[PDB]
Design a protein around this nucleic acid. Structure first.
Ligand SMILES: [Zn+2]
Ligand SMILES: [Zn+2]
Lengths: 50, 238, 87, 61
RNA sequence: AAUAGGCGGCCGUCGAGGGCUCGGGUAGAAGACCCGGUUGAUAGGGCGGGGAUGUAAGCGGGAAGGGUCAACCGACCCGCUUAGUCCGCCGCCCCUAAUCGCCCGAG
RNA sequence: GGGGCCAAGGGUGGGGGUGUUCACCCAUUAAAGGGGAACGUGAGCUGGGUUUAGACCGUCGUGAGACAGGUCGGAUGCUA
RNA sequence: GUAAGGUCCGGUGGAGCCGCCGGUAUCGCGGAUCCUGCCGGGAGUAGCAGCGUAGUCGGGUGAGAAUCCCGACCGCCGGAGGGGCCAGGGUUCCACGGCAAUGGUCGUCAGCCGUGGGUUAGUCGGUCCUAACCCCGCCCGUAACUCGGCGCGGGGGAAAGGGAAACGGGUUUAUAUUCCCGUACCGCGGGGGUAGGUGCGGCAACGCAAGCCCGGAGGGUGACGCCUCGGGGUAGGCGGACCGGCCGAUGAGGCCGGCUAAGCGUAUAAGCCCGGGGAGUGCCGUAAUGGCGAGAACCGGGUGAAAGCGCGAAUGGCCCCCCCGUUAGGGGGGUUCCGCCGAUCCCUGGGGCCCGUGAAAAGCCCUCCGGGAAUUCCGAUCCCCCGCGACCGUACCGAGAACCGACACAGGUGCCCCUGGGUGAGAAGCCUAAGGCGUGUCGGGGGAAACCCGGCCGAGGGAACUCGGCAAACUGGCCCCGUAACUUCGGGAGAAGGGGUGCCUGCGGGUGCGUAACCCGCAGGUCGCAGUGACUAGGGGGGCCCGACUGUUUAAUAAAAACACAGGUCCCAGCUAGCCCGAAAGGGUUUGUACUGGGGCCGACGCCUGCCCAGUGCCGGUAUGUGAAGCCCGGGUACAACCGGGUGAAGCACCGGUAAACGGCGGGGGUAACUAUAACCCUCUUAAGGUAGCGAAAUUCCUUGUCGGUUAAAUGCCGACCUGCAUGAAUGGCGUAACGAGGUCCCCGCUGUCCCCGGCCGGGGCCCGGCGAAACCUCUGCCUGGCGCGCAUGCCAGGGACC
RNA sequence: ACCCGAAACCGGUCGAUCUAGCCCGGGGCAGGGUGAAGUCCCUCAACCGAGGGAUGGAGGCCCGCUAGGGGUGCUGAUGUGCAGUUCGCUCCCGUGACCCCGGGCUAGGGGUGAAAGGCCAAUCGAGGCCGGAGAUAGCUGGUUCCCGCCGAAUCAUCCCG
RNA sequence: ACCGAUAGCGAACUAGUACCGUGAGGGAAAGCUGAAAAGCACCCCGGGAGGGGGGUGAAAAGAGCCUGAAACCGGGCGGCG
RNA sequence: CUCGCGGGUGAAGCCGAAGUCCGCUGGAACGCGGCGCCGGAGAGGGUGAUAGCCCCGUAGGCGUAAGCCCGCAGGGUCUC
RNA sequence: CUAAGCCGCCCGGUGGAUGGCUCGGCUCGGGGCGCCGACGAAGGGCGUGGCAAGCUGCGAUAAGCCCCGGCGAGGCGCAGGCAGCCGUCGAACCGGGGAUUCCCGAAUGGGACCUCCCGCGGCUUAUGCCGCACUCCGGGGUUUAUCCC
């Protein structure tokens, strides 16, 4: 929305920062056992809890 | 079964609560201490229309700086002066104890108890007649035709309530009735119990007739006092 | 336009800019004129305007220079005559 | 009516928002209390014995 | 047609006879079927015949009037004009394309 | 004309009221026969009647309500 | 080994495993429309049509192009598919690099994957005020509470209500009323002056800089419904002249640009006011209503909006021209006027309606009272200047792909605000400018069928079709004439029915200064089958039933005769009432008071509403009978338990009113000019026997009652009779104008409903290249007579059958 | 109590973004027709009267694909749909009892209802969620290895049987 | 004398996590290379994904990694056709 | 009660025997055959196979600040 | 040398059963230990790593800071990488004691349609500090308001 409160904006910012892929160096360090995390999200498909 | 309209009205929901914020305020007399043993002058400043009152109302400013709202008697003039107290002259718009009002006079806004503010004869176009005066009671005939005894110190105003004859003209339209009843938030339109389901009304049923006499006992419990309640008789008196 | 400007409490004007683009300007409506306390007739010598315009003016430019500037001339003269006679 | 076309009117103010106390999105905003922890209606937490939700949090069920 | 037929011709023990490809419909949902394929009028193009509408654009004249009763404007009409346009019909002319090529095939 | 025999190749239609089958009637006709096929045929159709949920009238029942008594309205799925 | 099963050989595997005795157990699989996982046939099939059918030709990038990019052509929307923006979404926004997956096909493209970025405020919103309403504290109730509640005190509550202040140009890949330049405004504090403390002009309305600080009161403003109309403006639009440019014959002629913000200064209109003035066989005025001795005409004036005008401002924006043109740049011109139409956008006044009365506070302005300083002094609402102005949102879509509906859903939310030219009454239909799109995203082929959906036409007849004129067809705009029964006098009514309508050449008329603009007639000439030529655009009439009308209803099979309605009548209540919610406390009607509050029934309007109080219900009385506990008396108990009597309220019994309270309103015996039926009239029978009306009815079983009209033919509709199985007066009776997507019958006109079906157009179907499921499935799957759980592809005997 | 399946009943809690009602604050309805009350004027006579012409804009008025709202027929298309109610044509209202947004209140034997047992988040002749709960049924379905030996019964009395 | 990854607590693991509903509340799936990464250097082809040689290892056990069944599908072989 | 003294218990923790002997199979000995050893220790686990003696542990012992408790010595209160 | 088709064996793909393993569960006699919070709890929001998304741990001193003891050469969590730094002045790790400890939350000076905002008194030169909620107990002053301490 055009008008937002700061607390909601900060929570949305935290979710935005969370939504990213696993580092490639993490993948090689873990030997391909860790390839993803449960916080991956698609804006038009998976909606935020808020 | 299910509840009745009268049963649901007792819970004070907004569907039934009166909208007491569109109105101008209650019209009560000034405290009895001012009026008793003293007579106060007041000036009529404005006459206006109260959404739910059935009568016009007027603003009065008294010589002691107190402002009040009163039921305007018929023929009241803006800018005129009125008197409230035992020594007030007998004229329309004057308020004074029933002991000082001669018999055969029309009065309105009578106090049930000295200082209660007035309960009787407040509707538009109504008046009561002073019948007899005694040292311990004054008899007054009310609009309903009853002779009621009031304490001599009870206060009343001389004249008749403005707005009479309101029922001469028809409410031609369902919309006219709609606005009239929406002004005060009265349940409108109303249904017929005989056309409800048996769950809703004592007279409800597939057939649109009452299966029982419509005169209900005065001792019937809530949810059953429908129709003619404790009726002495019914029908047309010849 | 924004929902706030969709209200009819704003008067809207279409203007063309010196750069050639048409713009919509919104302004707040002016108040009514002062009315006599007693009879309610309009007063004289009291300009209309919102609080900022009223504060933009000096004291003597917003009311007439005669006693009882809140009444029209008949009412002013009548009240003074009554007061003098009573005194 | 009552079906697909009805769900298009879910663009108004949400019924429930985040709760400052329990952190769950159950704060009834119009009435002013939480439907999960009772914030804004009581000082003590809203806990019921017929509910296993508060046991699920600490794996104590 | 399980008694799964008769006959003339052509081939085999390299090879008759076909299919795809090509130009078109006496045919057609795919398949199938029919005519033509330089031993040529199959389609297109040109010309000529027969048709359907109904007299083109342009120019010249008239036109109820108006216009300074002048220049000019004017719906519409008459002549060149059985015109102009068009043809999922026919005839003549190899001018263009029906070419190059590929694959089963009994023993 | 009346009665009976052989004969099932062919024909046996169009209209008025009524949902009607049926029966009645009209003008023609050689005649305008009766029947079986899950009372042939709704993964062919139509939905007028029957037979839900709404409502009116008559009668019955104290009442809720009911009537092989009337009346208005009332859905017909398919890529073989 | 009968078997449940055991053991051995060949191969894979790489670390555990078994014989026997004795115990223990979540100890043995074919089914539960069993549960979990995986895979099959259907199947390379449906779908990728229908509501907007859109692409083609050259060039480019690229391994790869119907699908991506540029140019032209051809198209769609154009009162929305264009522009602005809430809620919701939360990075979807921007650039570069990409195509394993997503995208109904492909894809070099992307709301997709990787990398790096992006949201700047004293003025715009929140923040301030309060509205409906809500919360905490005290207090009362509750066993108690996180529970219910009146009163008092405090607080909150609107991002579309009230409410201090900013607009132009430019800038970035992405932000701008926020950043840069130019020009302003408000709040607070400060400095130098000045008006004033101690000042003036007007008969007056009024004109003025017109002392400072603290507290209080009053007035105004904030601050207000709906309908209707006049006046004054402004956006936008149109025609002409001139300047520059593009097309055109480098003709006529068409199109494109000719721009201008806040702020500052400045005036009138309506309204109202101020002085003079002294009218009537009356004058004055409006669109209209109207005004006058309670002061008209008329002559002077004051105050008072939107606007325009000057600065801002040309140095800015826009169009064009010239030289340098290898990139990269630099200069010169202009941007000026008249006449119309004109808003739904602004300002301002009239008038009308309410049994309907259409918010509050904050803030702001003025006046008046009290108090406090000021004289070589104090001191502004007036000029000049200086300093300071915190916190949070600010990207983007804003929807036929960025929201909700599981979806890049034909729905819903938001069409929430706004809209050039022609035709035209019109924001209608059609065409078109601006802006947008070719992504309502799979393409190609074809006489390439049948058949299905959506359209166009059909000779002769014209409803013969059908339950039923279902569907389609006829009429259709405007001008003129003309118009029935009935009626509640309003209407019916656009009844019905008839005539005209194009283009061209000239006149007359209305308002107007006008040969500006809009509108109204007249004459003449002329073409077609057709002149509202396309688009737009009623078919009509006559009976009956029901409901007065507008309105509401089962979201998702019922829109109706059902509900509501206005009007009628009945019942309770004088207020510590009546009715109602609760466990209580308290509370709704109640900021109320009989012209009121609450409870039933009928349902506009016209004429009317008859008899019955025995039954049931309700209301009043109640001398008397009965009548629980308690109390009293006697008996019994060293006291009680216990037994018998007396008094005994309500309620019953008894008595009386009450039917616009529930309901009921029959039956026999009969009778008058036959042998004709029926009963004016008498007699019993229960409380009394159905009165006015209506009647085979939406009620009538016999029933397709009987008679008359409608047809050639009438289980229909209409009128009548009354033998009303089983009508009837407020669960109203009868009638009724107007009204109706209500039910039903008939007539004109019309037509492919039908005789009797035939052609044509677009999309599917069909073929080809791609993506690609699901319902369903015991295994199978030819028939005639049969046996059979009585209706067999599978059994019996026969007949057929190449895949 | 061998295992599975009920409609239902009770307790405490969650819901008025859908939809019903009411309160507070706000946006919208092209164009045209008809012509109520009110207010008048003109001409001839005048013992009475007769004949014409205006102005004004009311209505739960009228036509209307304006916007917006509704849903009669085709019993059209679709009916593993675009869609767990949609699309086209036709049709009805369109100044009012009108349509729609923001803020509030009414909650389950309860609310709300122009009364259809309608609506109360795809759920209504008593909502949803967890708990009693592994409810109960005489009713339906299922119940897992092998070989040996013997091998029935549907009938007398009683039971709301 | 408990079960041994459909078992055992719902969760052997980034599990009361992901995800579903406005809400009260509901709630999964998913363990294993090798002794040691020695996790395939270099060569040919392909736009790339990959393919074929050649190496490592006792064994490809090759990360889609212990063993590798059944159903299903492609090919070869024997019989019928 | 502790200005004082001694003692017990008390965190991490410390010590704790015996083969990595020869030959084969093997990628790798914890395996097979032979020869030895400790044992208050042959519970269990790891280590490239199944190990009492390779390692960790085990049988059996040791240490420990703060804190807690008992005793000595001294200073007080109260009861009978 | 049969087209389609059916059965059997072999090889290959698909799939993840079986066998083996197990830092996880479940159940137990006995034994140990059992509260935290206004000196601000539990629970939650947001931050914090060079490359850092989840979990875990920590809190603007943010996979950590300081001190006294054990251990004795490696260490930088789940988690096998690049590059770096830490440690012999004794780290990592273990037991004990301290420091920092954002916001909401009984939440408390006053408010919550957004875990974010707005105030009043004293000290402080200023950077900044200590108080200010309700219902009571034991006291004081006084403004007699329950006003202040
Ligand atoms: Zn006045
Ligand atoms: Zn909470």
């Amino acid at each position: 929305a055009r008008n937002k409160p700061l607390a909601k904006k900060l929570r949305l910012a935290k979710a935005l920062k969370q939504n990213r892929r696993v580092p490639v160096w993490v993948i090689v360090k873990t030997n391909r056992r860790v390839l993803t995390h449960p916080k991956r999200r698609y804006w038009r498909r998976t909606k935020l809890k808020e | 079964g299910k509840s009745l309209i009268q049963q649901r009205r007792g819970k004070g929901s907004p569907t039934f609560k009166s909208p007491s914020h569109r109105f101008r305020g209650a019209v009560k007399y000034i405290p009895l201490n001012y009026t008793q043993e003293k007579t106060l002058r007041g000036v009529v400043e404005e006459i206006m229309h109260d959404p739910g009152r059935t009568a016009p109302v007027a603003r009065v400013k008294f010589e002691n700086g107190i402002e009040k709202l009163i039921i305007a008697p018929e023929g009241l003039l803006v800018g005129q002066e009125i008197y409230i107290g035992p020594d007030a002259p007998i004229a329309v718009g004057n308020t004074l104890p029933l002991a000082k009002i001669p018999e055969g006079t029309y009065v309105y806004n009578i106090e049930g108890i000295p200082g209660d503010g007035g309960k009787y004869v407040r509707a538009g176009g109504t008046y009561a007649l002073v019948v007899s005066r005694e040292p311990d009671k004054v008899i007054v005939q009310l609009p309903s035709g009853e002779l009621k005894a009031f304490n001599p110190m009870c206060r009343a105003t001389i004249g008749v309530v403005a707005g009479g004859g309101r029922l001469e003209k028809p409410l031609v339209k369902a919309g006219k009735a709609y606005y009239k009843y929406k002004a005060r938030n009265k349940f409108w339109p109303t249904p017929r119990g005989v056309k409800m389901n048996a769950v809703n009304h004592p007279f409800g049923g597939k057939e649109h007739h009452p299966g029982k006499p419509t005169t209900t006992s005065r001792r019937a419990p809530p949810g059953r006092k429908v129709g003619h309640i404790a009726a002495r008789r019914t029908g047309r008196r010849k | 336009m924004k929902p706030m400007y969709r209200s009819r409490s704003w008067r809207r004007k279409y203007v063309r800019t010196p750069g050639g683009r048409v713009v919509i300007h919104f302004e707040r409506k002016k108040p009514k004129i002062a009315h006599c306390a007693m009879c309610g007739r309009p007063l004289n010598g009291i300009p209309r305007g919102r609080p900022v315009e009223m504060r933009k003016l000096p004291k003597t430019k917003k009311r007439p220079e005669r006693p009882m500037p809140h009444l029209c001339p008949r009412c002013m003269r009548k009240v003074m005559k009554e007061q003098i006679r009573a005194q | 009516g009552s079906g697909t076309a009805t769900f298009g009117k879910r663009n108004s103010t949400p019924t429930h928002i985040r709760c400052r106390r329990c952190g769950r999105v159950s704060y009834n905003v119009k009435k002013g209390y939480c439907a999960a922890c009772g914030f804004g209606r009581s000082r003590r937490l809203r806990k019921y014995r017929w509910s296993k939700k508060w046991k699920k949090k600490k794996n104590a069920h």
